[PDB]
Structures are given as C-alpha cells and as structure tokens.
Design a protein around this ligand. Structure first.
Ligand SMILES: Cc1cc2[nH]c(=O)nc(N)n2n1
Ligand SMILES: Cc1cc2[nH]c(=O)nc(N)n2n1
Ligand SMILES: Cc1cc2[nH]c(=O)nc(N)n2n1
Ligand SMILES: [Mg+2]
Ligand SMILES: [Mg+2]
Ligand SMILES: [Mg+2]
Lengths: 266, 266, 266
C-alpha cells in the first residue's frame, strides 16, 4: 500500500467538515445500479475529483443521504483493477468510511451467471467468494500491516454476514417476488475481456455461481477494519458453456436494498 | 499500458517507409518454428533492435515476404513474460500489424501435452484457451481503454476463428497425414520453470489439453483490435502425471501454415 | 530480478569474512519453529539488518552453528510476499547460501490442513507443490536468466529430493512416534488473509494437502541453482470446509530436523 493512515484520516476529516451527514451504512453501487442514489433524501453529492486523496461505467460521485430512514453514503461508481488501479487504490474509500464511523458496508455488482439454474434478472445474495487475484498475491492488504485498521492475518470465512443474509431472505419474502432470491459464491477475475468457454467451465467446476471483475478487494478491506458486510450480484447475463431484463432487475435491487436499511442493526 | 496510440502509429509508419511489402497476414513463430521465414519469397528482414519502439530462443527479427502467394509479415521469435516483459510490451507488435493493415494473425508455439491421447510430434489446432495470468489481472488490456483499437470489454469466447479451424482440418486431410490433426484448449502459465506433477494434474483437470508460457496475450490484443486469429501448438513433450520428433513436426507445421495461406479470406 | 550476481557474491564474501563456520546445509525456519536455533553448538548470530544486501513473526536473524554434528546456517524467520516483498527479494538468501558452498536446503513452514485425514500437530513431509502465484507469472526467476546460477527453464517435478524423503520416513520410525508421518502437496497462495470455505474446497479439489503463504519461491530458486531440497509443513490448523498442539509439534519437528542432519549426504 502507498497510503498512510493519516491520508485516510485527512479525507474522512475533509468529508466530515463538508456535510452534516453522519452515515452508519456505506453502499458501493456497481454496474447499472447508479440509480439508487435517486432514492436518497437530504442528498449531498461530491464528485470523486473534488475529494482530497480519492482515486480519480458510472458517475464517479459520492452521495450522502437518508435511505428508508437510515443515514448512508453511496459510491455511484467504483474503481476497477482493469482500469489500471492497484487494489490499495480501489479500496481507499472503504477505510475512509470506517473513519467516518460507518459500521456496515453493502456491496453490489453485475455478474455473469455460472450456476445453470440462474436466469438473467436474478439477484444473487453473495454467500462466499473466491479471490483469484488474491491466490497470486494481488491483495489490498499486501504490504506492512496497519494495526490501527486491523490484524496482520484476517479471517475471511465469515465475510458475508449471516444475520444480514437471513434478513435478506425474509425481506425478499415480504416483497412477494415470484422468483426466489438466489445465493452463492462470487468469483473475481481481473478482466477486462469476457471469458472463454473453457474458462467458464473451469470457474463453474471451482464451485463459483457468478463471475465478475470487482467487489472482493472491497470486502477484504472492509472485514480487515471490522465492517459488517453483505452484498448482491445482479445476473445480467447467463454465460455460454458450449462451443434488458437487467434494467427491471436493477430497479428491483434498488427497492430491495432500500427495504433492507430497516434490518441493519443499530 | 505505457504506449500511446501514436507510438504504435510511429512504428507502423516507419515500417511502411522501409518496405514496399503490404502484408495482410501476420505470423508469430514460436519455439523451433523460426525456420518458416526461409520459405518466404521477396523477403525483407529487420532485426527488432532496428525498429523504433520494438521491445528489445529465436532470432529477434521481423521478416516481410510472400508465402504461397500471400503477403505476410513474420515474427521470428516472440517476447515472453518470464523474460521480465509486461504484456503491454509482449503484445506491442500485434497493434503495429493492425496499423499496417494486417487482417489475420496466425500464432504458433511449442507446448507440453496434457491430453493423454497426445504424442510428441502432434500438432494441436488451438480451439480455446485458459488465461491463468488474466485471472489475477495480468492482462495486456489493463489500463484505460484505447477506443481507436477496440471496446472496453471484448468477448473472447470466439477468439479462435471457426472458419479457419474448418480450413485447417480440410487442408490437413489434403496433406495425407497418417496422424490426425489434434485440437484443444491451450493454458498459459508464467514460467520459466517447468511444472510439477501436481500442477500438471490440476491443469489437466481444468480442461487444458496443452500447457505453454506464451501466445494468449497476443490473441487477446489481436481480438480486441479486430484481427481474425488462428493458431497451433507443436506438442514437443508429453507431460509426466505420475510421481527430436519435435524437428520433423516443426517442418510439418511449416508446410501446413504455408498451405493454409491459400485458405485465408481476401 | 533487481540483484546482480555480484550483489549475492558481496554478501556471501562478507559472511565468509565474519565467521569461521562453513555450512553445507541451510535451514529456513517458518512460523513457530524459530526455536531450532537453540539446539546449535558454536552458534554465531547476525541480525538481518547487519548483513549487507539482506532484505530488512520471527527473529529476523541468521544463525550459523553445528546441529547434530553438521555445519548449518539457519534463517530464524523468513521474508513474505504479503509483507510487500517481490520474490526476488524473498529468495535473496537462497543464492547467498549456494555461494557459501551450501549443498542442501531444508524448508519448514506452518500450514492449514486440507487433507481430511490430517490433524492439528501433524507433520507433513512436502512431496510436491502447487505454485499459484507462479501460474500468473509472479516468479523469483522472472527476468533475464543468470546462467552462473542455472538454466533458463528449470524442471520442478523432482524438486523434493526422493532420497531425503526415504530418510525422513525411516528416521520418523526410529523416533517411535505413534502418529504416522504425513506427506503431500503444499499449495502456496499470497495472503495475508485466511481463506474462505469456497477457496478451501477449491484448493482441496486441486489436489492440495496443505495451504500456506510461503516456501515455494525458495524451493524454485534452490532447485534452479542446484541445491538438494526437502521440507516439512507443521499442520497448526485444520481448515473448515463447511458453511496449542502446534507447540508440541513444533518441538517434535525441531528434534526431527536435528536427527535428519545425520542422513544428509556428504
Ligand atoms: C454482467 C457481467 C459481468 C461480468 N464479468 C465477467 O467477468 N464475466 C461476465 N460474464 N460478466 N457478466
Ligand atoms: C515444449 C513445452 C513448452 C512448455 N511449456 C510449459 O509451461 N510446460 C511444458 N511442459 N512445456 N513443454
Ligand atoms: C497455520 C496456517 C498457515 C496458513 N496459511 C494459509 O494460507 N491458510 C491457512 N489456513 N493457514 N494456516
Ligand atoms: Mg443538505
Ligand atoms: Mg525486397
Ligand atoms: Mg564462534
């Protein structure tokens, strides 16, 4: 990592100096879900280019506001390794949120469906992940440990909060959806090219249910600094294993995350 | 990436200024296939060290010429990640070729046979690939997208041209070879060490038919900029899964690629 | 790599100038096995910070001495990729040892047990490895080859010396242990976070018996320069595949390595 603890502190202090908003929840909005910021009350926007130390698709804006009675901060757009970012830059905002007093991180993305029972328009609660770049040492925690954030060797087996996963299923039932809420394992790869058929079949055989190019590094850094995490993949395509509806599902995920603010503790 | 669009343009213009040759096909010759340049008529050679912007085994020379009636440009020798090159350097010449007006890229390499039915001396048409460095984010397209070359998120599932694969099988039949033309999935790993038995068995179980240390990044960049691609692995060794003839096969691959120039469209 | 052959030479000469000890064996002590240096006779210690060119957990000290009648040099503590080291720094001392005249490298680590028949306190002879960072090109040999050390493309399938593995089993029998000596495949990943359940199940299905964050790069560089290699994992935890005793085993591994000095050739 190239940021010091004080760089994260400088940024969080700057934000605290520019808004009265004191969010307890942070939401990182992935592809096609930038529309969720429109649901916010008492909204305040900062372009990423205006926030000291922020890394330079979606808007590139941070929006504070009230969602279903809950103070939250949202990333409308995220940072991607395939854009040339190292993970220590991709995940900069996660530590900033911890230093604002955020306790819960919600992550969303759009993903390719590997599980043969998934359909375009499915929402997958993320139950677990597989971190392929992490296998090779590309990791946002690589470098000397900052103990002011967390431990040298953090556990990742409980990353996706089990109580929030229960709330998620209960809430979905309340919504009266005809399609079941999917859940499963997300695998991250670098991108930016889409996968070959041979790569897809390999990934499915590893136990992955969905494939994307983001999110995992944010979850690792969140868990390291003690945030509660839950998240969702929008299944916007079903992958080909042999040699649109995303819009309505995105709107559905927006209502869903909105309802779920009620179920986040404290 | 560290090259600008104009760097590729400067190089292509320099080449166009130094030869009357106007190739429509480019061929990257892998290990033991540097001998194919000897088949060229009206041949013109440039050492890589003489071409502005070119990255600094085989010759390290670019040879223009006519092969079986077709204008082509050949890399006698390629660049390898295990030599210390980043992929954006390994693949520099591919974009240069696009800017010369090349439409088709033929890739060749020598590989270890993972499929138990392969023998030393086999030629494998590459049907598909698995990009292991790409899983971790080592990718020649990593960085901001150059739209003058192609799209942010290119498909890779159709990388190995299906019509050329049909031509390849038909031509091989015409040659009257007693051994069948193999085809399958190539997996790239970094190298430069050869694999352990445990690594080989894992790779086979991923669905790979052959293992090598090159080629995949060239195919990705080729497809990104719209080149038609086909390629072959020379099976120069059969890998050990339990705890020479390459020379005649190389000459055979040379005749084979030579005959196939006739079947490339336009 | 950033070191020249002469950098390794400078360091080895400096060491030869500061001790009369002329070790034929080198031992790299992993997590919880720093206690083995206490068994040494005629011991001489150098903090890593005192040795020119050495990269900057355990002690960070190099200890020369006699173990069970055999001249050896020990790393009390190793260097880790997750600390921010590139492999060419992690493995610097291995080449230094070759230049001191060391012929045999013993590697030890603590690992997570993936094989369902392993228990906490097991010792696993390393029979083979899987190098995940190596699949993506993170490799200590990446860069131009130094022929004064070894070949461009070294074999890795015979990395863990078969005769030493026989000695190891015979010696363990002599010790009269009630638990069998385990043996198996070690897989390295980057860390520093521990694995998810989905990652563990994937790793087991690749054929790995134990998971850790070290060792493999040291073995690769050792084999490249011609060292005989053997090693052991201490199974200090059994990994969870569903959604302490390490101290006595560490002392046992210490006695075990001590006895085995007798069985190293010459
Ligand atoms: C919507 C979406 C996003 C991704 N990312 C990916 O790596 N592979 C896919 N197939 N998809 N699909
Ligand atoms: C001829 C050849 C080339 C390679 N490359 C590789 O990674 N593994 C092999 N076994 N072989 N064999
Ligand atoms: C003692 C130990 C060391 C490691 N390293 C690792 O990557 N995963 C584990 N589970 N463990 N356990
Ligand atoms: Mg306001
Ligand atoms: Mg001429
Ligand atoms: Mg002394």
């Amino acid at each position: 990592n190239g940021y010091t603890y004080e760089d994260y502190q400088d940024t969080a202090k700057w934000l605290l100096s520019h808004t009265e908003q004191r969010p307890q929840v942070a939401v990182i909005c992935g592809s096609g879900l930038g529309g969720l910021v429109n649901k916010l009350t008492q909204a305040q926007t900062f372009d990423y280019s205006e926030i000291p130390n922020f890394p330079e698709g979606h808007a590139g804006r941070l929006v504070f506001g009230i969602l279903n009675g809950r103070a939250c901060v949202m990333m409308q757009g995220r940072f991607h390794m395939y854009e040339g970012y190292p993970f220590w830059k991709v995940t900069f905002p996660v530590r900033v949120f911890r230093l604002l007093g955020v306790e819960t991180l919600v992550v969303t993305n759009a993903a390719g469906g590997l599980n043969p029972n998934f359909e375009v328009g499915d929402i997958m609660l993320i139950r677990d992940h597989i971190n392929l770049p992490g296998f090779s040492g590309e990791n946002p925690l690589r470098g000397p440990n900052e103990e002011r954030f967390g431990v040298r060797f953090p556990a990742m087996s409980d990353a996706y909060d089990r109580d929030m996963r229960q709330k998620a299923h209960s809430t979905w039932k309340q919504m009266g959806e005809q399609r079941e809420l999917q859940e499963g394992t997300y695998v991250m790869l670098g991108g930016p090219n889409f996968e070959t058929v041979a790569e897809c079949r390999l990934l499915r055989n590893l136990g992955a249910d969905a494939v994307g190019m983001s999110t995992v590094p944010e979850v690792i850094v969140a868990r390291h600094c003690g945030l509660r995490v839950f998240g969702f993949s929008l299944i916007t395509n079903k992958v080909i294993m042999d040699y649109e509806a995303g819009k309505q599902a995105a709107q559905k995920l927006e209502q869903f995350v909105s309802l779920l603010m009620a179920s986040i503790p404290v």
